[PDB]
A and B are shown apart, each in its own frame.
Chain A
Amino acid sequence: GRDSLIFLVDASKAMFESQSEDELTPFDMSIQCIQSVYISKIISSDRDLLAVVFYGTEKDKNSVNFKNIYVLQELDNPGAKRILELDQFKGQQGQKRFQDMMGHGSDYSLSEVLWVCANLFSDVQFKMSHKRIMLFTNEDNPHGNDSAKASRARTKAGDLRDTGIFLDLMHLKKPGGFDISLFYRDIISVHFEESSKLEDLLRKVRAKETRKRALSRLKLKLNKDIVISVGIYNLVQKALKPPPIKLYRETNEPVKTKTRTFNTSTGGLLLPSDTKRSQIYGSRQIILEKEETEELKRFDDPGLMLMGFKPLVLLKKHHYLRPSLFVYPEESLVIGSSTLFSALLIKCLEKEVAALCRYTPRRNIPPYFVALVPQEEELDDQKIQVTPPGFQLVFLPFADDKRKMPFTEKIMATPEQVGKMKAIVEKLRFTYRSDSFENPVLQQHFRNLEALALDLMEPEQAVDLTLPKVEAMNKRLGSLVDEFKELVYPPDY
């Protein structure tokens, strides 16, 4: 449920060495990779557990008590001085000191290493799912000498994949990024792409957050006589942080502050009995029970009702407000809405018609009128899903929505502009994407925490464009905005 993800560096010998190359030991590149995912799960803050281990080496860290290994850490959600604790390992001083202080390279034996790290899959005491491992190697030859080691590769390998446990080798630059194809299968283990490097890892997880989540499950009675139960889902919440946590000063420790009510006149206490929930205006104070309030919500019950069918195009935006998060109607428990819900969306979409509902949130609420667009089902060859089949949970518009908005005259433009304006926008347009879109200015703080995480000087201080780039603005389009400026006006801004 909260799963496994694993760092590993191969060792024969020369790997922790740089191949005498003048940039880095690709070993070290791997080092910052480890840094990058383990750090990454600071941001993503993933109850997935992470692994740091090496092998193939001089001394050992393990419980399996064999040559050419080191544990680094056991499976973990991260730690600040788990980060720091591993932070020694950059730098040639830290290359070496890391190496020798631990000892660096002698021999190894492959599938031995398999059940090594696998036997870090032993380390699981908890609920995990994903078994995912990464070897760091340029190794062209595991060995030529004992091909019984090779049979051991092709032997235990299939076991460990069959173990559901999956390690691959990303294209880490042995020359050509690798030149080897040949025997390599064993070494390695909703439409997307793949990459050979860490940078993708780096930025991709710079802002990243939770993955496996579906929890509170409501229903929809369609009519009074027929059934569906409805899965509540958050495509997101407009995801925010785990928020500021109380820890006292020098003690550093959680306050375990509590709250109740003393009497605020006499030194006595107060109790929910002793108080109530009031509205007050003018002269009259008026007091009614926290109960009385919470059940004044009551109309029906948490649950949902097909309230009808509407033109989809009937409302585009005259309007908009707090989103649908996405309810997928459950079909395992209640199926046939497999079929029902299926052809529902089929034809209602065909009708450009939608199923209105009155949604009743959890432990009641006052419920509300909200449309449900049938959500279509979009999948390509490898099945990118932009539209998981379902409903758009479409809030209806209401008085408050319209509580105010002005109306007055409008003076209008001319085609003389649009002739240029269009292509002007063609310079201002970009094909956009699903991706690289956020409010990082909050991200920057879990950068600021990446600090104490590594305990270093300045953050990653990475780059997303949520802000426009001038060279392109003044580049592709140019100053034709001048033409527009003096079209109808000498502005002085």
Chain B
Amino acid sequence: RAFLGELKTQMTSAVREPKLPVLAGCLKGLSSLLCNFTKSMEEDPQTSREIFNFVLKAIRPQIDLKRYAVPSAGLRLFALHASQFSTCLLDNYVSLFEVLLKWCAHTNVELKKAALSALESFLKQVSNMVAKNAEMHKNKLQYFMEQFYGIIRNVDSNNKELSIAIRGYGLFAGPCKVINAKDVDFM
């Protein structure tokens, strides 16, 4: 929680940017840490959340996929119910979600797959409380739903390459149990 803290700091006042080697580690083994957490709540969502959100430009690009390697496993291994988090921030987030998606996805690189991974994944967690929620997922369901849905039909007229896989899962993630509260019948 120190390392958490002083990197939370180093992200701030030095050229607005941390030392990404140092986040790569913090998050890196923070993998295992989270694996052991049992439901982080307060800071940590923002911790992660931030780190990825700041991974999103040319910053101090080092082995530039390293820049991308930071989130690579970073979101990935973070499957927790603590990693069920931006379900707090989602309708906001999913914006950011696809922003990173488009980001590295379209960023011409040798690790796309990570994107795809967490994409599907936090995508899933979404889908999961969605599966558990009519209240916060009926509309806000259809919020995130349509968020991606622009991509759903986006595939029809465009060339997404491997991103096709993407849709299907979201093309699933739309219809999960969902025809109950939101009819996927035509789906």
Q: Is there a contact between chains A and B in the complex with CB atoms less than 8 Å apart? A: yes
Q: Which residues of A does B touch, CB under 8 Å?
A: 271-274, 289, 291-292, 294-295
Residues of A within 8 A of B6 (CB): 271-273
Residue B12 at the A interface, CB < 8 A?
yes
Residues of A within 8 A of B13 (CB): 291-292, 294-295
> Told that A274-B2, A295-B13, A295-B14 touch, could you supply 8 new A-B pairs with CB distance under 8 A?
A272-B6, A273-B2, A273-B9, A291-B12, A291-B13, A291-B14, A292-B13, A294-B13
Residue B150 at the A interface, CB < 8 A?
no
Q: Which residues of B does A touch, CB under 8 Å?
A: 2, 5-6, 9, 12-14
Query: What would be 17 A-B contacts, judged by CB atoms less than 8 Å apart?
Result: A271-B2, A271-B6, A272-B6, A273-B2, A273-B5, A273-B6, A273-B9, A274-B2, A289-B9, A291-B9, A291-B12, A291-B13, A291-B14, A292-B13, A294-B13, A295-B13, A295-B14
CA distance A294 to B15 in the complex (A): 13
Residues of B within 8 A of A292 (CB): 13
Residues of B within 8 A of A273 (CB): 2, 5-6, 9
Chain B residue with the shortest CB-CB distance to A290: B9
Residues of A within 8 A of B9 (CB): 273, 289, 291
CA distance A411 to B84 in the complex (A): 86
Q: Label chain B's interface by main secondary structure.
A: helix
Chain B residue with the shortest CB-CB distance to A295: B13
CA distance A291 to B5 in the complex (A): 13
A422 to chain B, nearest CB (A): 62
Residues of A within 8 A of B5 (CB): 273
CA distance A292 to B13 in the complex (A): 8
B3 to chain A, nearest CB (A): 8
CA distance A29 to B131 in the complex (A): 97
CA distance A65 to B130 in the complex (A): 88
CA distance A90 to B99 in the complex (A): 81
Chain A residue with the shortest CB-CB distance to B7: A273
CA distance A222 to B5 in the complex (A): 41
Chain A residue with the shortest CB-CB distance to B12: A291
A365 to chain B, nearest CB (A): 15
Chain B residue with the shortest CB-CB distance to A294: B13
Residues of B within 8 A of A272 (CB): 6
Residues of B within 8 A of A274 (CB): 2
CA distance A244 to B12 in the complex (A): 38
Chain A residue with the shortest CB-CB distance to B1: A273
B17 to chain A, nearest CB (A): 13
CA distance A274 to B14 in the complex (A): 20
A229 to chain B, nearest CB (A): 20
Residues of B within 8 A of A271 (CB): 2, 6
Chain B residue with the shortest CB-CB distance to A274: B2
CA distance A298 to B2 in the complex (A): 26
Chain B residue with the shortest CB-CB distance to A291: B13
Chain A residue with the shortest CB-CB distance to B9: A291
B180 to chain A, nearest CB (A): 48
Residues of A within 8 A of B14 (CB): 291, 295
A122 to chain B, nearest CB (A): 40
CA distance A292 to B6 in the complex (A): 13
A270 to chain B, nearest CB (A): 10
CA distance A292 to B14 in the complex (A): 11
A88 to chain B, nearest CB (A): 54
Find the residue from A271, A273, A274 having the highest chain B CB count within 10 A: A273
Residues of B within 8 A of A294 (CB): 13
Chain A residue with the shortest CB-CB distance to B8: A273
CA distance A128 to B130 in the complex (A): 71
CA distance A331 to B5 in the complex (A): 45
Chain B residue with the shortest CB-CB distance to A289: B9
CA distance A107 to B9 in the complex (A): 75
B43 to chain A, nearest CB (A): 13
Residues of A within 8 A of B12 (CB): 291
CA distance A272 to B7 in the complex (A): 11
Across chains A and B, which 8 residue pairs bring their CB atoms closest together, nearest first? A273-B5, A295-B13, A273-B2, A271-B2, A291-B13, A273-B6, A291-B9, A272-B6
CA distance A289 to B9 in the complex (A): 10
CA distance A62 to B37 in the complex (A): 68
Find the residue from A274, A291, A294 having the highest chain B CB count within 10 A: A291
CA distance A7 to B50 in the complex (A): 64
CA distance A124 to B14 in the complex (A): 43
Residues of B within 8 A of A295 (CB): 13-14
CA distance A273 to B7 in the complex (A): 10
B164 to chain A, nearest CB (A): 46
CA distance A291 to B14 in the complex (A): 9
CA distance A271 to B9 in the complex (A): 13
B19 to chain A, nearest CB (A): 13
CA distance A348 to B37 in the complex (A): 68
Residues of B within 8 A of A289 (CB): 9
Chain B residue with the shortest CB-CB distance to A271: B2
CA distance A296 to B13 in the complex (A): 10
A159 to chain B, nearest CB (A): 48
B15 to chain A, nearest CB (A): 10
CA distance A291 to B8 in the complex (A): 12
